[model samples]
Target: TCPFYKKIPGTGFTVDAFQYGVVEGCTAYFLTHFHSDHYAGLSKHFTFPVYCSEITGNLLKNKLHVQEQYIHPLPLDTECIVNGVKVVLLDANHCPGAVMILFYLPNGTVILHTGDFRADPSMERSLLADQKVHMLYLDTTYCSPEYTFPSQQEVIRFAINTAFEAVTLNPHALVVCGTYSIGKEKVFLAIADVLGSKVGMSQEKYKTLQCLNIPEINSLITTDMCSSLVHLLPMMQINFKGLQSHLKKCGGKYNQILAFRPTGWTHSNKFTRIADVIPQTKGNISIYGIPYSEHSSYLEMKRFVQWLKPQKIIPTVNVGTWKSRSTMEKYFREWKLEAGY
Candidate 1:
């Protein structure tokens, strides 16, 4: 990292303040998306004015519920003046609320930050029409062809069908699964839509989701208000006795519950043990697989790098983890580009 000032040698944009942590001087941060990977650091420490799409603002308000100034919220495909810089928020197409930031410097240089974008036709068109960028910082989480992600709709359908089969297969069972509270809205919607259920949210999440005006969402119910069909809040762990008591009053309508994990887990196999306890108690638990990833795929990443054709590229995430800079270099060599940490 450059000290004192962040100068992109070719671009000539001077950053007076920058940090891996919170910046003391700059009071504003353009939060491109609401996923934990993007705003995880800010949600805990940074409580200040953050610029994001209106949809993203609602997600933050409804899910995270942090103290944020949402009045000056910028809509997608619109430009706003933040800290005296012309910054534009464009559709990233990674998720419903994610956005790509385009920063236009006063000194005749344009920079594009693809904050976890996919190769949607609309997004590709927007990138081409936008200013020719001098530098591009890309999300390389699924940078290899071996990695793949199912479409959002396909994953949701799979989850719904899986949950339905589990309940049908086992009459008296509590089906608990996994999904992030913020990023996995579709999973919740799918659960509610299929099971005709709702999640009993805490007072805060209830208010946030309401304000967001999500088209399809049913709130979870409580034990006292237990009914035939409903989902519940995330569990630290699911138990048999607790599930059995809930199912006892179901009147033999296959008293089943659908649970989704909050946020993406790194080691999914380890979580299977955690999720297995519920099945252990009921003797039948179905794991509804939802391959709903918010990052761009390997094809999209390769095409993104080839399209922008920037002088230099920096891999935002997956830098020092399993995928290294040298691994990315192979892609660069194939596309005739260069990348660094």
Candidate 2:
């Protein structure tokens, strides 16, 4: 008996699954984050109530332009009622607004939906740690043994030191980092804080940051060009040609560009040297493809499974085939055995 947690087995609640459109009996929609992949099908046209963190709710109103009436901002670390179910939001530590939704269904089903998260020991210390989790909706992006990588703290330190070394050698060197709308804000902010510099981004990306209520971060970003040593750009514009065009408007202020292209795709099975980010150069533009990720690594997933020991594990990623699920299930089996479960 498989529980179709994609929409909750017996309930009308859909968590981070708006792309499927309105299910026949869906009474409420619960979004865990503002990431595009999780919130694909949501738009201004959505009529049902969207339950999420206040930060994510602000984004839904401002960035996605969803109507105000449907947006409901919930508090973190506090249990609240949604229709008839007891729900609580735990900080996912994946992004600014991302969270893991814990649902206490009437049928005594304690469901934990992890929406693209980096596994931390703190998560295991929560209220769910003492409770028996009936079902676990996991983010299985890097569930294989070969997909292991360093922790976010290690990667962030590498980024900061690399940028610091660049500026130490050449004061005119500009650090151009490739970033998404909501994720990887911590990395960029760390780099700027170390260099004592401000971040420059387009007005469009700046508005996305406005939704976040961090006052210190508010002062660090600007639309001005010369005042900022760190410039944030889309992944498409991190290449040599893009930096060339971007520098043309800098008016000889920054001589060279140290581009940081932080993404999980930069990592592979063979990569054991965590900080040896692959580097490429073309004239004044040098790009480093950092093995930075927001999702949990293989070992982290293994540890999470052993630590949590949910009664059932339901993957939310790479479920293209029946065999793939079984392949991912291998880790859970192995970890469960190790945990004596």
Candidate 3:
């Protein structure tokens, strides 16, 4: 395991961030997406030249207020170089502008950093066509066998169904569907499009969605909470006290409240399932958690690892201890042998 900003075995460039604090010895930076966690230490203080997709670059400029000169937009499926190291960006299929970075070293070492992506069959096929990965920095967010969630299609359908059901069951009720500031526009957009309802979001989120240029979502964006039967808010507002405060602020406009939290943590236990709605009813508001995730399940990770057969697997999570290593080893031993690699 190479640390966050250390150079790979055969490359001149290092990983994300520059003028590093957590990990050091990097001249350049490569960002996978615009998530807060990924961009934890980055701010106006960061002065290193950063590269990411166009959308992520926009977010860095507009959302994070990063300087324009420091941010570079790397188009998808395009190749460029930094100090003799070849780099290519592929669609990660996680959030918008999330990318899988491939570094082609002069020494023939192809290092793939799968920057928080789910299993995309087409992406898998395309990468499998290259089939020359030497090292893979994986997004093993759900690498255990227990996380067996259905596809995003099924999850989105369930969310839409649940939202519509809530509205139908209680016409006067306010349906609060919770999601991250990004990465769940599909669910909300589908809910608005299918149910024929305007979804209200904060002005900031509305502007972010507008930057995405999705017509379906653009039409659904609204700030008029009173006119909208559905209130699309961030995942932070799904709790009892949170909802209680929100209801009071709404001036008792709706008789009932139904909260639908679409997240992956519902598959796990309760504590780690932050922003996930536990199936419970408290007073006039009821909460339901749906397993809507953009990460690969255990089986999906297994298939991906076997197909690529990277010589080394680096888990990107913080808890990369013996347990995580053994779990990865178990799958690698089982599938890598079968694949005859």
Candidate 4:
């Protein structure tokens, strides 16, 4: 149903959901992007057509292979009347086809669902240059303070330095790197730039990396492709699974092995527990501790909340909601002159 509502345990205030594709007194569904978490249980449920931007629609259709008939592709920032709901698509840089949905109902309720974003300056350059939002559904996955990651450039520097060291030690060894299919294009490009040659990855990796459009480093090849004194091959994360296994395979051929693990490796004890589950290897796995997170941290969250100046703050996470509502309800003194969220 439209204007979906759920009651809080103790507060008399009700939680009403007003999203895109919401019809007047009827059920309608809006999709942010094709990511797994946002899309959980959605494909199973039968409902109205899913609304998204044109680029997002193409990406969803091409990458995720969503059914073409079910999509309603609206242009970005184009105020559309989907069953009488006022909505627009803002950029969310979590991945390709990502978006932040804005909803303004006839009854004067405004909502901003930030699907998943890193507060990248580019995002400000794209959609949110106006500095306007209300009732933000933020991505608090990395809201804790300890996860202070360095810039992506810094991570690339560290990875390249390690790679150089490995190649200096043993030129015939195979090097591997871990990266997402979506956002790792720059990592691969940085590697090629430093090595002055394209690294060796599987056919699938080559296919995806081809989309990166890095001209300076595209023509180079693996060790066998070169006629140099010795050669180094770049392997994909999938083919070269373990640290010890990779080192052992390159033992006779090369004097050393190097790998680049970029992004997604957050410095949390929880992640440490997950790493512990895997069997330890003999090869050196130097975690060049770098803070390169893709989500807003706790301090950033607090700063954003203060900037928004919402009348009643409703916090949600794995922990719970509304525990500190009273204390956090206060708005910033500067924003006090502005309207409440």
Candidate 5:
């Protein structure tokens, strides 16, 4: 369910995991992002040296309270060497400080670990222009035709417009934006900017946003519960009953609450049944599940494979969730048919 590992030949380098204590012996450690799923089993007790983006490293040191000496901060888009293995960290576009690691091994093999990223067009120029990828460790979160999602920018626009409309419809209502612990800061930041209000974040999330230092975000975060007209909370805390409970406790400061969830799961047929922006309402609260995702869809995955043409595709998802290898085969076939290849 967590912590995947990949090793470079003769280099003793491991990515997105750590092996220590009784086992011993590791040249370096690479962290793609600070997500708990990717960073499982890591903590202040971690003894090995960890390498990641400057933001991630800062979070590890300042937020997680890891020792400064154990954390190595790598500059974005820069090349570095560890135990004879050449490495480059490229922007992953999944979340702030997320990176797609490119490793140039001593044997002339180029390996890529796309930690967790959406296949946006910008990546081709930055990552796939002049390299032959030997192996690709991919993020196959939506490797099925059932997930035909719109661009993240489009989804963000939809969320902003909907929030404005929801507020206009009910001036006495509060607009709540749902997000994960780390990712999807863009949505809340945009909402806060457009609505001319600050986002109410948890103590932990506030510290993380501060550490990230994203523009237009530092001033937008607040721990004040009653000051913000628009509230930004975790996805689990945005339900209708939760809002009702909040109103009950507050004695009717807000007549209604409208929430929006920006996520990839909204694209699944089981959730939406079609690619449309529809609101699921309950009581005096309305919620919209937007198709804003960081993972590649089946079509995007095929396009990525066509561009890189890696000899082997190692899917990052667990086996019980889906048959990743067979799914890739089907995707390749569909891609060829659509391209007339």
Candidate 6:
């Protein structure tokens, strides 16, 4: 990695850093996903050709309106020659189209850039276990011990049970699920299935979710806003003020609003379990903060670091300052040292 910039040193490759400018020494560009933070500056005016997963390329074409010819879509688990470098794409499982890029240089260096990942135990069985990875550009968003929480399956089960309970008790409560453009589908879809209700969304929302090509979604969506008791809204609009405005506009159709905002930040060590964390109730609005994280937890990161034992570890998040990076590196250093690196 570059000493200052996010680019790999001496290489013309850049991953999800277009906001900083995608010029100079850049032979090709890689986009890990379609998240706004990653593809901030990407537009029709972009100069270079883009490479990403086939699903991500589809999103780039339909969502961002990028040119089809300028995009190269790679299949998962297959090594393809990229700029004469051996590159492979692995399903990140963080979001719908997210991928972890694995690169092996001709100089006998193996580098894995985990764009954003919810790592699992099976990762050890992959080619990574045999490669002897040299440099690992990690997603260190939850690289501290305090960020550990329940597994995604447990959290999903908890959310389904709690949300089902909330809606059953409060009949008039409109369940609005908070989600990004492509994230948090599992929780909301589970809620929709158990309730057996159509999801309320805009026409554009249907088209966006259709990119996922999941079978269950087609029958579950309705463009009419007032038709479904369960609704899908962007994370930004799920706040108390937004819900209050929405309720008043409905003209007494719904008496109360129950919204679920799912993210990793909602979980904390103070809570013994997922059930212990309570909802915030103010007036006619009740907001539940569900601990549904897409990134790897601290314990997952530790396990991965010890297992892979990369020669150098680079922080992808919270690296703007020395203190912040060193703080996160504390665990990596300890892990590598203990592993006899």
Least accurate 10 contiguous residues by lDDT in model 2: 1-10
On residues 152-269, what C-alpha lDDT tens digit does candidate 4 reach at each position? 6666676666667666676665455555445545555566667666656545445544433335544654433232222222333323345555555543554444444444645453
Rank order (by lDDT, best first): 2, 6, 3, 5, 1, 4
Candidate 1 Cα outliers beyond 4 Å, as residue runs: 1-27, 40-48, 58-71, 166-175, 202-204, 216-225, 228-232, 235-282, 321-323, 337-341
lDDT of 1 at 261: 48
lDDT of each residue in 1-341, candidate 5, tens digit only: 22334554456667776433322345677889988877766779887778899899988988778998989888877778766667889998888889988889887888888988888767888846878888888787787777676677777787788778767777788878787758877777787778888888678777778888587565777888687877767678778777677657545678888787876665254555323657777778888777677777767877876777677667776434446667666775666566564
The estimated TM-scores of all candidates read 0.71, 0.95, 0.88, 0.63, 0.89, 0.92
Cα displacement (Å) at residue 110, model 5: 1.1
- Listed per model in order, the count of residue pairs whose N, CA or C atoms clash below 3 Å is 14, 0, 0, 5, 0, 0
| Candidate 2 local lDDT, 1-341, one digit each (tens) | 11255677657788877887667788988899988878988887889999999999999999878998899999898989988888899998788889998888898889889988998888888876768888899999888877877778898999999999999999999999998658888788899999998899999889999888877766799988688999999888888788899989899898999988888844353745865555798887899877777889888777877878788998999987889888987878888888998
Q: C-alpha displacement of 239 in model 2, angstroms?
A: 0.7
Query: How good is model 3 by TM-score?
Result: 0.88
lDDT of 3 by residue, 1-341 (tens): 34643356654455554334634455677888878777767777667778788888888888778898988888777668766778888988888888888888787778888988896668766744675888888887887777777777877767777777777887778878887757866777777766678889788877787666465664577887877777877688788899888888788688888887877745364243333435678899888777777888888888878778788877776344787777766776777789888
lDDT of 4: 0.50
lDDT of 6 at 76: 87
In order, candidate lDDTs are 0.58, 0.85, 0.75, 0.50, 0.75, 0.81
Question: What shift in Å separates residue 263 of candidate 1 from its native position after superposition?
Answer: 8.1
Candidate 3 clashing pairs? none
Number of the candidate with higher TM-score, 2 or 6: 2
| Cα lDDT tens digits for candidate 6, 41-144 | 88777768899988788888888888888889988898799888889998887888899888887778888889988888888888676778888898988887
lDDT, residue 15, model 3: 52
